[PDB]
Design a binder for this molecule. Structure first.
Ligand code: CLA
Ligand code: CLA
Ligand code: CLA
Ligand code: CLA
Ligand code: CLA
Ligand code: CLA
Ligand code: CLA
Ligand code: CLA
Ligand SMILES: CC(/C=C/C=C(C)/C=C/[C@@]12O[C@]1(C)C[C@@H](O)CC2(C)C)=C\C=C\C=C(C)\C=C\C=C(C)\C=C\[C@@]12O[C@]1(C)C[C@@H](O)CC2(C)C
Ligand SMILES: CC(/C=C/C=C(C)/C=C/[C@@]12O[C@]1(C)C[C@@H](O)CC2(C)C)=C\C=C\C=C(C)\C=C\C=C(C)\C=C\[C@@]12O[C@]1(C)C[C@@H](O)CC2(C)C
Lengths: 194, 164, 41, 215, 210
């Protein structure tokens, strides 16, 4: 358990307290069947892990000054000569798209339709932290919590770019340059009236 | 201009025949005083006539070699070229009323067989019953297709035969 | 006069009342709508 | 109980316990269209969805219409708002309606099969884990689950209220749209414009002063 | 339906307005609150519309009372309908964004108290601070009562709160129409009704405008 997400609320009986990242947050009763919940615990982590990799790649471009996350696929249209760390890579769009279709489905088919496991014991733990003895559910909780923050923050990137058209650090510097005039209400999009 | 035709607002034998009819009415009108009701009637005939030609050209009716309004009874050539009011609108304006009379007459016969002697109530129409089925049959396609789904519309092979 | 209303509810009398209804309805419509060859608006 | 005409005999196919257990049952069926029970059950599903689309529709007509006559919007009249917002757009209307009927048709054909057999889409393996929440409730037309984010369904009392409040705001909105079409043909102005015209002169500006209540 | 005080003395009663609710006199001629699931909602709905009105009428009159006396404010003498266009350190959109998040805390904190009383009195981060148990929705107490009131004679204080509240809701509904017809400050409408009380009722100002 370790949390209630709305204090005073009852907990849903179909969410076991053993599970990492549990708060009893399912107001839709969206995981009442156990097979649906078992698929969802697989899919929350993988959405969480890819977003933690996604939100880090969106920040470290602006932390290193390579435009932003929205403009990194602006070489396939309106030019070419894609960069990475400043280094050129001489691939057009239609080759690497075929490379990332074969090789990624080759890693998906080893992952997805070869079981249902989401914490694989073995080669995906190089140093060795969670040996499933005692420190497993603690670090699994942190992988969820940092992961849930990342999925919010990536959704906080797309809606921020749909509204203002600026990147993460490019408008975080603006909210710090104007605390009361560079928020989600001064644009006539998120609040339509005032 | 769909099938060798022309709009009646654009053809000239149509307008020639309009001027042919109004010529015949006016040379018939000349025999009467301008106050007389045999002339009031003929000038009212003309204003029903001239509005009739105005309304046929307004709807975009198709004339041909003879200058008469030709009808196009095909959907896809009436829906495409704006002529569904010729045939394609009254082919459902009819079939509403047609199956209406069929359904009211059906429901009157179905609801008379469970009686003492139903042949008497085909002479003497039960007017409080028949008008009741007449008003409430106004959603007859909504009632028929529900009866079509059951199997209660079609009576089975209880029907009478000779030598199959 | 209940027997008289049975006579008014026979087959030819309702036929000659309803046909004066249905013709008389179409006559009044074809008076106030002169010559409907095609469905206008 | 509370009939549409207080003196009428309510027809007997609205007084059965599978019909008096229904929202908006005011004894109104002067054509007898729902005498068949599954035809009542099918027309009950037609009324819920003609009214919810109308409540969403009428709130897409007067709420951007009242908030335009009061300033702070520039949404035009609803009978001309289809003409605009296609140039502030990207597809032709043919290229937009076909994707619409794909998106709407996948929904409607799932609601079709759930009417035919309740709990159709709750069978396992339909969706990708999402098919569990699609059994509806014990009565159809009210799915709940992911269609109830705020969780108003789980009461079992105050529940017939929310039913009958939905239907009455729903039936009023269906007459509102049948209004909106008719008060656009007859006068060509806006519906709030017709409300402004009736308020500034009630006793001369109405449907008795146009050519559609003609003697 | 007893010897309770009544809005019309001698009139018949609905029967469900016995007296447990703060300041009732049986006034419900439209029979709106027969269902107790609606009456429990309407009681809390009365208190919130009342308390925000007592904030409103004291928030309109007192900045006008101490301005027609004449003090020095950055906003002084500006009308309550003319306070929206008045500028501040920020535009009013961003101000409304702060309201719709701070109240989205407090109202949902208050609504969670309404659906289960006795289950909202705990802070998130300070898990020692709490309001004392036994309270009812609409009267939280604890830090909400810092002066140490409501330790006796709570019914008359609730009756004072609903009577000083119902007068304010009439006063703010006064403020809407009486500043919409004549278009003045509703403290200065008192000036004309005290200049010549007999030559300006609501009727003569209606009839001059009509
Ligand atoms: C798509 C990503 C995703 C998925 C699959 C899940 C899946 C799950 N979450 Mg989770 N969560 C997520 C994102 C996700 N979460 C994010 C981003 C947050 C932070 C806001 C949380 C916060 C959260 C809490 C606090 C808790 C869960 C819980 C759960 C479990 C049960 C609830 C359920 O059935 O959700 C299934 C969810 C989906 C199928 C996603 C549906 C999305 C819909 C279709 C559209 C949503 C639109 C979006 C809001 C805006 C765009 C389940 C394993 C509970 C649990 O036990 O944790 C394991 C719990 O207590 N989650
Ligand atoms: C092309 C190769 C390929 C293949 C074969 C797969 C196959 C698979 N992936 Mg996968 N994946 C791929 C590429 C691929 N992926 C790439 C390139 C990425 C990174 C961008 C991912 C990221 C990824 C994640 C994060 C997850 C999977 C999952 C899965 C499995 C679920 C299968 C399923 O439900 O099908 C569905 C087939 C689809 C094509 C998905 C439909 C598209 C989705 C819904 C994205 C749309 C998001 C959008 C915001 C929602 C619509 C808007 C809505 C709110 C209105 C399956 C083994 C899930 C899993 O483990 O289980 C899971 O959680 N994959
Ligand atoms: C005996 C039957 C018959 C015949 C010979 C035609 C003949 C024709 N139809 Mg047609 N049509 C018919 C019945 C028929 N139609 C019926 C019952 C329908 C359904 C209401 C249609 C719907 C239809 C459409 C939608 C279209 C045609 C078109 C055409 C033309 C090709 C041709 C003149 C097409 C056309 O105009 O030419 C390409 C066209 O677009 N028709
Ligand atoms: C198309 C929308 C629609 C649909 C499907 C229904 C369907 C239904 N209504 Mg409903 N109703 C509607 C609109 C609709 N209504 C509107 C707009 C109002 C407000 C005037 C009402 C007011 C109303 C009351 C007061 C009552 C009903 C009742 C009923 C049920 C039985 C009556 C029947 O057989 O109707 C079936 C009808 C159709 C399937 C379609 C008929 C369409 C006609 C032919 C067009 C009429 C146009 C009009 C004259 C202008 C049935 C579930 C009764 C009920 O719920 O009790 C169980 C009841 O007491 N309705
Ligand atoms: C439901 C519904 C209704 C009642 C209408 C009704 C109308 N539409 Mg419309 N429309 C609809 C769905 C609907 N449409 C859909 C689903 C689309 C998307 C393809 C459009 C796209 C559309 C366009 C592009 C236009 C209309 C126009 C019109 C008006 C023609 C007169 C009329 C008010 C026309 C209009 O308002 O012009 C004045 C117009 O130009 N509509
Ligand atoms: C309820 C309510 C509401 C919605 C308002 C709304 C407003 N008041 Mg107001 N007021 C209220 C009650 C209310 N008042 C009460 C009960 C009193 C007594 C006052 C006394 C008052 C004065 C004296 C002034 C306002 C002003 C204002 C305006 C700007 C607010 C401001 O500067 O932030 C205030 C910002 C703060 C950080 C203060 C809140 C901190 C509190 C005091 C902690 C306790 C705004 C229209 C100003 C105005 O008229 O501007 C043109 C102004 O000068 N109010
Ligand atoms: C004058 C109206 C009035 C009255 C009689 C009460 C009476 C009561 N309130 Mg209440 N309340 C009111 C207005 C009022 N309130 C308003 C407007 C608000 C919104 C801010 C609240 C918010 C509120 C809360 C949150 C709580 C109470 C509580 C209480 C109870 C005990 C506290 C007490 O004795 O207050 C006596 C009231 C006064 C002495 C009023 C003093 C007013 C002075 C003059 C300040 C006004 C200055 C102004 C800014 C400028 C002029 C009692 C039933 C508490 C309770 O029931 O706990 C058990 C509790 O938790 N009320
Ligand atoms: C809260 C009580 C209250 C008070 C003290 C006033 C006072 C006033 N209003 Mg007013 N008003 C009120 C409520 C109130 N109004 C409400 C609720 C509305 C909305 C319907 C209006 C709408 C309104 C308009 C449209 C106009 C006034 C006008 C006036 C002024 C002239 C007096 C008059 O014609 O009476 C008006 C009386 C009424 C409208 C009847 C309201 C009766 C209230 C609700 C109940 C009585 C309260 C209480 C028992 C008696 C007062 C004593 C109390 C304060 C101690 C005067 C300063 C006129 C003005 O500005 O001219 C100078 C004017 O044109 N008022
Ligand atoms: C937000 C999200 C999911 C949100 C779902 C929520 C909150 C659901 C909550 C609920 O269900 C529960 C819990 C319980 C139910 O009862 C109730 C609701 C309320 C329904 C997923 C995002 C998931 C987001 C993900 C996975 C994002 C991945 C992004 C990646 C990989 C980005 C890559 C790039 O950015 C780089 C790296 C570099 C750039 O230049 C190029 C690109 C390619 C753009
Ligand atoms: C669905 C509906 C309307 C939906 C409208 C929508 C979505 C509008 C959308 C738009 O506007 C917006 C949002 C924005 C615009 O820019 C674009 C469009 C697209 C234009 C109305 C239903 C309207 C439904 C109506 C009017 C139905 C009326 C039926 C009645 C009165 C029948 C009664 C009877 O059938 C019974 C009940 C019993 C029988 O026994 C007796 C009789 C009397 C026969």
């Amino acid at each position: 358990k370790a949390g209630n997400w709305l204090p005073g609320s009852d907990a849903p009986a179909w969410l076991p307290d053993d599970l990492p990242g549990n708060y009893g947050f399912d107001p839709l009763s969206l995981g009442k069947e156990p097979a649906s919940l078992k698929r969802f615990t697989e899919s929350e982590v993988i959405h969480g892990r890819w977003a933690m990799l996604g939100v880090a790649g969106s920040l470290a471009v602006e932390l290193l000054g390579y435009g932003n996350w929205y403009d990194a696929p602006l070489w396939a249209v309106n030019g070419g000569k894609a960069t990475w760390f400043g280094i050129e890579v001489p691939f057009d769009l239609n080759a690497l798209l075929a490379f990332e279709f074969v090789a990624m489905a080759a890693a998906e088919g080893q992952r997805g339709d070869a079981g249902g496991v989401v914490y694989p014991g073995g080669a995906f733990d190089p140093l060795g932290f969670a040996k499933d003895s005692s420190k497993s559910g603690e670090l699994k909780l942190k992988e969820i919590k940092n992961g849930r923050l990342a999925m919010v923050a990536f959704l906080g990137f797309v809606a921020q770019h749909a509204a203002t058209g600026k990147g993460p650090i490019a408008a975080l510097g603006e909210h710090l340059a104007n605390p009361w005039g560079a928020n989600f209400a001064t644009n006539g999009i998120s609040v339509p009236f005032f | 201009d769909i099938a060798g035709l022309t709009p009646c607002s654009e053809s000239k034998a149509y307008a020639k025949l309009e001027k042919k009819e109004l010529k015949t009415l006016e040379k018939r009108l000349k025999q009467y005083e301008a106050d007389s009701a045999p002339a009031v009637a003929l000038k009212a005939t003309m204003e029903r006539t001239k509005a009739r030609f105005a309304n046929y050209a307004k709807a975009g009716l198709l004339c041909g070699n003879d200058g008469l309004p030709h009808l196009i009874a095909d959907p896809g050539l009436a829906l495409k070229y704006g002529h569904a009011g010729e045939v394609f609108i009254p082919t459902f304006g009819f079939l509403y009323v047609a199956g209406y009379i069929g359904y009211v007459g059906r429901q009157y016969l179905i609801a008379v067989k469970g009686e003492a002697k139903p042949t008497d109530k085909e002479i003497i129409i039960d007017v409080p019953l028949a008008t009741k089925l007449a008003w409430q049959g106004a959603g007859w396609p909504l009632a028929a297709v529900q009866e079509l789904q059951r199997g209660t519309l079609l009576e089975k092979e209880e029907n009478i035969t000779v030598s199959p | 006069m209940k027997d008289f209303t049975t006579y008014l509810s026979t087959a030819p009398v309702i036929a000659t009342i309803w046909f004066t209804f249905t013709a008389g309805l179409l006559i009044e419509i074809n008076r106030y709508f002169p010559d409907p060859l095609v469905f206008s608006f | 109980r509370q009939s549409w005409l207080p003196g009428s005999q309510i027809p007997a196919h609205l007084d059965t316990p599978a019909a008096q257990a229904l929202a908006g049952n005011f004894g109104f069926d002067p054509l007898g269209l729902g005498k068949d029970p599954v035809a009542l059950r099918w027309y009950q599903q037609a009324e819920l969805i003609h009214c919810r689309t109308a409540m969403a529709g009428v709130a897409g007509i007067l709420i951007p219409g009242l908030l335009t006559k009061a300033g702070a919007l520039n949404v035009p009249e609803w009978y001309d708002a289809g003409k605009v917002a296609i140039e502030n757009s990207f597809a032709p209307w043919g290229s937009l309606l076909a994707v619409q009927l794909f998106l709407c048709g996948f929904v409607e054909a799932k609601r079709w099969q759930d009417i035919r057999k309740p709990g159709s889409q709750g069978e396992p393996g339909s969706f990708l884990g999402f098919e569990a929440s699609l059994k509806g409730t014990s009565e159809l037309g009210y799915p709940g689950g992911p269609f109830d984010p705020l969780g108003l369904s789980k009461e079992a009392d105050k529940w017939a209220d929310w039913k009958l409040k939905e239907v009455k705001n729903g039936r009023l909105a269906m007459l509102a749209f049948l209004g909106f079409v008719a008060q656009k043909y007859a006068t060509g102005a806006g519906p709030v414009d017709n409300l402004a015209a009736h308020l500034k002169d009630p006793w001369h500006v109405n449907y008795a002063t146009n050519g559609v209540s003609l003697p | 339906d007893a010897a309770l005080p009544s809005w019309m003395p001698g009139a018949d009663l609905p029967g469900y307005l016995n007296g447990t609710l703060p300041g009732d006199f049986g006034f419900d001629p439209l029979y709106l609150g027969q269902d107790p699931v609606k009456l429990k909602w309407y009681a809390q709905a009365e208190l919130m519309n009342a308390r925000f009105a007592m904030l409103a009428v004291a928030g309109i009159l007192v900045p006008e009372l101490l301005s027609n006396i004449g003090f020095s404010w950055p906003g002084a003498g500006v009308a309550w309908y003319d306070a929206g266009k008045f500028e501040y350190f920020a535009p009013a959109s961003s101000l409304f964004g702060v309201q719709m998040l701070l109240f989205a805390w407090v109202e949902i904190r208050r609504y969670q108290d309404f659906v289960k009383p006795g289950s909202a009195n705990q802070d998130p981060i300070f898990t020692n601070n709490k309001l004392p148990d036994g309270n009812e929705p609409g009267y939280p107490g604890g830090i909400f009562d810092p002066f140490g009131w409501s330790k006796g004679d709570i019914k008359s204080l609730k009756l004072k709160e609903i009577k000083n509240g119902r007068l304010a809701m009439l006063a703010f509904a006064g403020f809407i129409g009486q500043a919409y017809t004549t278009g003045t400050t509703p403290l200065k409408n008192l000036s004309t009704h005290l200049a010549d009380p007999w030559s300006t009722t609501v009727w003569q100002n209606d009839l001059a405008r009509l």
